[PDB]
Amino acid sequence: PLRSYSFRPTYGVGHQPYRVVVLSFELLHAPATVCGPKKSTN
Amino acid sequence: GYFKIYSKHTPIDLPQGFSALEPLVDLPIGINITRFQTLL
Description:
The structure is cut from a larger assembly and holds two copies of chain A. Chain A is low in regular secondary structure. Chain B: This is Spike protein S1.
């Protein structure tokens, strides 16, 4: 049912190991708890 | 969607006095509390 990528260190750029991080987000009515740094001045 | 707990501890039916509970913890929890039970 499923085959294998099988990369080599000589493949064309083409089919080369590419890492992917999908950062799905949420906006449910439940309170937000993930936020950015929120920089601060002096 | 926030779970808030206020608390106060005193040394002493219930006492016939006034004391205001202070904020202990607000937690972003997320559940929809409908029932509860004590643990001893």
